[PDB]
Amino acid sequence: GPVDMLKNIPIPSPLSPVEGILIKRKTLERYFSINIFEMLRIDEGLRLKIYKNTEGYYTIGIGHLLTKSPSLNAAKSELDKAIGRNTNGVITKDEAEKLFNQDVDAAVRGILRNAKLKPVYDSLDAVRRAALINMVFQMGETGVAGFTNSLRMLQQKRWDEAAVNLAKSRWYNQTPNRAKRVITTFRTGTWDAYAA
Amino acid sequence: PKMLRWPLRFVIGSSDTQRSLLGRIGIGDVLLIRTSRAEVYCYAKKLGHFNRVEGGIIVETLDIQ
Amino acid sequence: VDVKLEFVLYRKNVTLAELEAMGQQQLLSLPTNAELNVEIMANGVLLGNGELVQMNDTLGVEIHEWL
């Protein structure tokens, strides 16, 4: 939903707001604050013309796999089904953000139907929820639910233990750069791996 | 005579502010929302609750008299 | 002393018809964009606006415009 797309300002606790409500701009300049659009754009890229990913299949926008079918037609038939206008394999930026908002919404409602992921998701702050959504983007709901022991350490706020354990994974071995960014996000609960 | 149109405000929250804050508040500042609400207002009259759904807002009550 | 600041997601001028149609759960459409322009109001007067942001233990509005 709309609340999942919000910019997150990862100020630690406690906040010292002026008279309980006002945080000054000068205090906020110290913090690097983004939304999950900006995060998955960094990990997956933003492309407005159909391309083939590393995998390598037909994809579009921010990590949106169209087909595993090698036919550009039908890759175009599902892109077109997705936007609702006849794109000749070419979308706008708005359509990309629309397609992204739909893909995140599907990811979160997937997490919430999963008996393993929901309790962990429910326990996390919004920045670490983004990290969990990131992993669901990369490898699917079922694939993320396979991180049994890390998920349990995340739930118990054993951040350093979870980060050590996530580093022992295939995920980390295969896509180290992105894995390290996501693990940094779990360890610290900030967007700092995304400052570049 | 009668009133034709009614200005509705869909309020998602409020914060009691010490008037001394204005005007220290400026661009780039953050204002915390201390009390989360989801109410339909027409002037000072609370009409009912709404809910933020997929494509917009669904209003529940609207008690108008 | 205290003033009550309201955080207003949306405003609409409505007829009695629109009002009763709304009274029975008819979808009022918002751009998904809507939380990027939350309005800050005090005593029926608009004071400024900004973007809804997520903080760790609460929501807030980052001010884009003020008075």
Author numbering:
A (entry chain C): 1 to 196
B (entry chain A): 5 to 69
C (entry chain B): 3 to 69
Task: Tell me what the authors wrote about this structure, in their words.
We solublized the pre-coiled-coil region of OrgB (residues 1–30) by genetic fusion to T4 lysozyme and found that it bound to SpaO SPOA1,2. Herein, we will refer to the SPOA1,2-binding region at the amino terminus of OrgB and its homologues as the adaptor peptide of the ATPase regulator (APAR). The SPOA1,2–OrgB(APAR)::lysozyme complex was crystalized and its structure solved to 2.0 Å resolution. The OrgB APAR forms a lariat-like structure, contacting the thumb of SPOA2 and fingers of SPOA1. OrgB makes substantial contact with both SPOA1 and SPOA2 of SpaO, burying 570 Å2 against SPOA1 and 470 Å2 against SPOA2. In the APAR-bound structure, there is little change in the conformation of SpaO (1.01 Å r.m.s.d.). In the crystal, these residues form the docking site for OrgB residues Ile17, Leu18 and Ile19. The OrgB surface area buried by these three residues (360 Å2) accounts for approximately one-third of the APAR's total buried area. To test whether the SPOA1,2–APAR interaction per se is necessary for T3SS function, we constructed an OrgB triple mutant (I17D,L18D,I19D) to disrupt its interaction with SpaO. As predicted, SpaO failed to co-affinity purify OrgB(I17D,L18D,I19D)–InvC when co-expressed in E. coli, and the aspartate triple mutation completely abolished T3SS in vivo.
Type III secretion systems (T3SS) allow the transport of protein substrates directly across the double membrane of Gram-negative bacteria. Proteomic analyses have identified the major components of the sorting platform for the Salmonella typhimurium SPI-1 injectisome: the AAA+ ATPase InvC, its regulator OrgB and the proteins SpaO and OrgA4. Here we show that a novel, heterotypic interaction between SPOA domains serves as a scaffold for sorting platform assembly in both injectisome and flagellar T3SS. Our structures suggest a partial model for the subtype-specific assembly of the T3SS sorting platforms: the heterotypic interaction between SPOA domains within a given T3SS subtype functions as an adaptor for ATPase and its regulator through interaction with the APAR peptide.
